[PDB]
Design a protein around this ligand. Structure first.
Ligand SMILES: NC(=O)c1ccc[n+]([C@@H]2O[C@H](COP(=O)([O-])OP(=O)(O)OC[C@H]3O[C@@H](n4cnc5c(N)ncnc54)[C@H](O)[C@@H]3O)[C@@H](O)[C@H]2O)c1
Ligand SMILES: NC(=O)c1ccc[n+]([C@@H]2O[C@H](COP(=O)([O-])OP(=O)(O)OC[C@H]3O[C@@H](n4cnc5c(N)ncnc54)[C@H](O)[C@@H]3O)[C@@H](O)[C@H]2O)c1
Ligand SMILES: NC(=O)c1ccc[n+]([C@@H]2O[C@H](COP(=O)([O-])OP(=O)(O)OC[C@H]3O[C@@H](n4cnc5c(N)ncnc54)[C@H](O)[C@@H]3O)[C@@H](O)[C@H]2O)c1
Ligand SMILES: NC(=O)c1ccc[n+]([C@@H]2O[C@H](COP(=O)([O-])OP(=O)(O)OC[C@H]3O[C@@H](n4cnc5c(N)ncnc54)[C@H](O)[C@@H]3O)[C@@H](O)[C@H]2O)c1
Ligand SMILES: O=P(O)(O)OC[C@H]1O[C@](O)(COP(=O)(O)O)[C@@H](O)[C@@H]1O
Ligand SMILES: O=P(O)(O)OC[C@H]1O[C@](O)(COP(=O)(O)O)[C@@H](O)[C@@H]1O
Lengths: 314, 314, 316, 313
């Protein structure tokens, strides 16, 4: 059986946007949608499958139970809940941590033995929990890490220099948030590193690097303020990841990888460039970032760890 | 200037789903988003452009004014209001008509000299008003017609026979509704006419054809019932039309075409197999459908004419 | 493992054209090239893999031994020899029959448990021998049948009507050659039967149908006369077949399928619309063609068996 | 008219491979094939169009005369000859130069007012001649430059590191040959510079970079040694360039761009990372390469000028 089967848990804005991006790109052969709200999951499957005759790939789409994970190649997790009046932000994390653990159990219980792709927030945390609960090797639990932040980073640079975003090569490291690292020292465009555009070409200036960096950090806020939520950007990032896994591409993507000394941190999943293939994450690419960039990464991972301890299971 | 520029007026579920489908399939090089709610339009443009680095094509996306329609290749109309508890189904058509008319006036005033793709409902009626208001040749105003019902029709057959939806060839003719015609006499799979499957192989029973036809007729209700609305099917159908035009494909699509005697009807836009190229609709394929199928088609157009008469400009 | 690996045996115009079509379409993830001419196979793999950085997919391409077939999903056969003076046109069929047969032996020896796609001519004949030698279910030995004739057929109709080839839906049935059947009774465009175009639309006339059917039958001669050989057309047909199998599309293609009564014939592989999936050919779609089209089909199959009996192995 | 028309002059292994790549990748809507041997051009048009029903896109393909260039968006030149017995390499260049100059004149005489993509070797030399003859802005004459050497350069690295070739980001600069520069200083994988792999991770040794550079420098010979000629690699490289122009991508490709100070050279077309859009080459990206690399680059551009001045108009 060469048929590729992907299960998407959670049929909200994110799950359905991922599914649609996958169908239009023709990435998988079978998409199973799972959601506590069975009617919603069915309504989505119906709608997503309607236009297939006009598509470039013949993808099967249907709503189902966890039994379907038994022979799935990979399971994408996006299921979660909203902020409820009467609960703190941490309360919410423990809630999504509980939900993610419940799902991970049902999935494993079906005899699933593929690869996990964690997209629900907070990704780094839930990725770590999925790892513990699943009992699977770290490399087979892939979080979305900083793929969205990285694509936004490239978008901003492309807009500034008027170049194809696919021609920008740089990354956003760490955990998504105020402490994410915009690794300018390791960002290039056509072979020319950003700091060369600055120092030697004088095409950009330090201030620009700061402005661009902030835009990435504030991207979710600007979007959420205008359309209530963000999901298209993440839909494409997740599909990119699934693509690299299913096609054993051995491509580099800044996903959530289990660190074991790289960047000077260990025992946590965070966003860093990594080689992705059919077995998950093969290895991390340890960039020799500047002391300022690394101190910012350390800080980023520190905050990550604080929260992780507040929910982590022994 | 080979860059293909498409403008999408209306940034709701339909317009953004068409945009997303286009981006992921890699159709068009420039997508301009326009909406009376300008903030929503920007939120969508920001979110839609965010993942372009992870895409298979470089598409520029941004929110703008009607002045962008000047050098645009084609404008997709999706704007309009939706049935509210406090109004009539005819009041709705009247409002959407007014909205579409005003929009077409702005577009034309921009200097736009391309092709119109009408996706907002009621499509056939609105397609007609866009034609009347633009002053353009009927072939330059292409409505989605029955592309959605047709891909739904093919889906149902695909599930029934366990074949590829794209390996099914037949159409839903006329106006979408309990009036639409399921052209069974001209539907084949792998060269075999449906009626051949019925009157020789006997794999299908007459009742099955009635059931499948009805599922196509209730598809939207089945979906709206579960997810408040439908948009993924139309996003793919519209993208298919846009792809055929931009690439001068000369392919057959059941879009809203101006009948001029075909099927025994005239002075009306409705869903029928048509050849689509870079100049819009070149011609209509006039299927020698059974007297029963034609009776239904006539009833579908009569209903269409009735409502239209209460809105026609002149 | 989700990595799709395909082996192409024989790196001539056809085999390399298929490889190039696959790379540019991004059909498989691993592409192994095998040829008796060791050096040629490597040279090809080198040139083919060279441009992968500018490709839309990351395909691994390399030349190897039949060992690679152990874990391959599909093995495409395109190996054979040309006409040798003093040799009969039938002697050649026997020669290629023993060549593909020997190859199938090597492949099965490696542990291969995938699907075969036979492209070397005569396709229906070699498909049969691969089935016999391989000892695999008929459904897992897929010959290109009339996919090439069918695509040419659609091209001619598309040219004549100024329509997208992908918008033409008809088939060429039987064995490629002087007896192939232009199944005009079951050919449509926009849902309209060609006969409706003729009889009711007066868009086409019976004479056109004859001229077009001959253009299909004489296509190879026409091209060979200008560029010595044909390979792009078949390259694209084989890739389509490959695409449908790996993706379990359940698509209809006129591949070489084992008949068991369909069309009134049995016990031979021949070109007919069939449902293709990840397990090869699932079932045949038996078209109720006219008696004239069926008489010609029967004729086509009869000549197929005549030659088949002069090379067929004793048992499967 | 949104239909994109491409004319390919020369229907040999290169021209036909490019057309096949474009068809399968679904680039362009009309492919016109022109060749002095009008029967061969017809035979290829027939064989190429034959499998369209099975394609991902609907591409029209036909053989024609230069009149087809009038409303063409892009014209690709692959026409040329190969060596013979006692024919100097300068003889080959001189004739392919006369052939290319004739062709361009025919194309321009047709009313053509689009972009030229020069894939016939010596590309840099012929690109310059095409530029001189046409009278079109230097930016509307795009040669394949080092796109092929660059994709080979990425392949070797990819093989060496076991990563996706599309994840490697480095370039070969100058003119193809023993003069070509393997700019290691500005090559990265996953954002990590090659020299970081050497100097810090130690995963790569100085020597390693030499072998690779040479595997790339000798790539052609190695292929011509086993299959008589090369075309699949150039077929894809050219399709990439064509796709970047037609879709106004603003992508960076090491095409043949008119230097005008960059890298310290001027009045010459050579391979350097440039930004490509619907108007051709918009600008060159002047990498700050190491003195060695720039010396090697200078060497390369110097040899090019020598030979150019012989057939230069
Ligand atoms: N990483 C990023 O860049 C990024 C960007 C945007 C959103 N997100 C995350 O995406 C997540 C999904 O929310 P959304 O935006 O898709 O809208 P959403 O909140 O409606 O999606 C949640 C869905 O999960 C389902 N669900 C909840 N609990 C369940 C359970 N126990 N089992 C099965 N299904 C259950 C709900 O019914 C709901 O449909 C959010 O938590 C958000 O933080 C991440
Ligand atoms: N043809 C089909 O098969 C099909 C299927 C489903 C829906 N539709 C139609 O497509 C249309 C899309 O709307 P929707 O479904 O996304 O609901 P929606 O509320 O999500 O989108 C409606 C958008 O139209 C915009 N709009 C309203 N008036 C406007 C004006 N005067 N100028 C500019 N923009 C304006 C609104 O701001 C809103 O964002 C609807 O009218 C719907 O009935 C068609
Ligand atoms: N079914 C169709 O529609 C269709 C159309 C065109 C061509 N074809 C067939 O495709 C086949 C391709 O042959 P070609 O055109 O590439 O000629 P070719 O000489 O270019 O390729 C033949 C290759 O087979 C290899 N070979 C021969 N014997 C071998 C063996 N025992 N093991 C491994 N390799 C060996 C040779 O080294 C040679 O490179 C032809 O036989 C032709 O009849 C089929
Ligand atoms: N850039 C690269 O990667 C690369 C690779 C190999 C060869 N080349 C060089 O570029 C050219 C590529 O052609 P090829 O390798 O396919 O060899 P080829 O013989 O297969 O193709 C050459 C074609 O040019 C045509 N031609 C010759 N003179 C012409 C004229 N006056 N008008 C129109 N057409 C004409 C011939 O008919 C022939 O079909 C060769 O001259 C070769 O030296 C470049
Ligand atoms: O810009 P280059 O170096 O020529 O390589 C282009 C490649 O860059 C990419 O954007 C990937 O770059 P990254 O490895 O940084 O993610 C691909 O989409 C594309 O194939
Ligand atoms: O022309 P239709 O009926 O709209 O369907 C178009 C389909 O026809 C195809 O060309 C397949 O035709 P066939 O089933 O006859 O082989 C597909 O490429 C495409 O999805």
């Amino acid at each position: 059986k060469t048929s590729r089967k992907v299960v998407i848990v959670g049929t909200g804005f994110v799950g359905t946007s991922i599914a649609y991006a996958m169908i239009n790109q023709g990435v998988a052969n079978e998409l199973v949608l799972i959601d506590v709200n069975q009617e919603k999951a069915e309504g989505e499957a119906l709608d997503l499958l309607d236009g297939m005759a006009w598509g470039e790939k013949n993808v099967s789409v249907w709503s189902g139970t966890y039994e379907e994970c038994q022979d799935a190649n990979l399971v994408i997790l996006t299921a979660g809940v909203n902020q409820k009046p009467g609960q703190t932000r941490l309360d919410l994390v423990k809630t999504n941590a509980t939900i993610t653990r419940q799902i991970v159990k049902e999935v494993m219980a079906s005899g699933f033995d593929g690869i996990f792709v964690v997209a629900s927030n907070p990704v780094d945390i839930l990725t770590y929990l999925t790892w513990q609960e699943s009992g699977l090797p770290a490399s087979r639990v892939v979080g979305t890490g900083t793929t969205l932040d990285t694509t936004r980073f490239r978008k901003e640079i492309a807009l500034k220099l008027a170049v194809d975003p696919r021609s920008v090569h740089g990354y956003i490291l760490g955990e998504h948030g105020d402490s994410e690292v915009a690794a300018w020292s390791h960002t290039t465009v056509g072979g020319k590193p950003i700091m060369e555009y600055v120092e030697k070409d004088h095409r950009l200036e330090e201030n620009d690097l700061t402005v661009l960096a902030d835009k990435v950090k504030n991207a979710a806020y600007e979007i959420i303020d205008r359309k209530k939520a963000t999901y298209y950007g993440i839909g494409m990032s997740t599909t990119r990841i699934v693509k690299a896994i299913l096609n054993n591409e051995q491509a580099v993507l800044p996903v959530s990888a289990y660190l074991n000394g790289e960047y000077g941190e260990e025992d946590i999943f965070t966003g860093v460039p990594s080689i992705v293939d059919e077995n998950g994450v093969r290895e991390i690419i340890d960039l020799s970032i500047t002391p300022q960039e690394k101190a910012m990464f350390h800080q980023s991972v520190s905050e990550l760890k604080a929260v992780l301890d507040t929910v982590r299971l022994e």
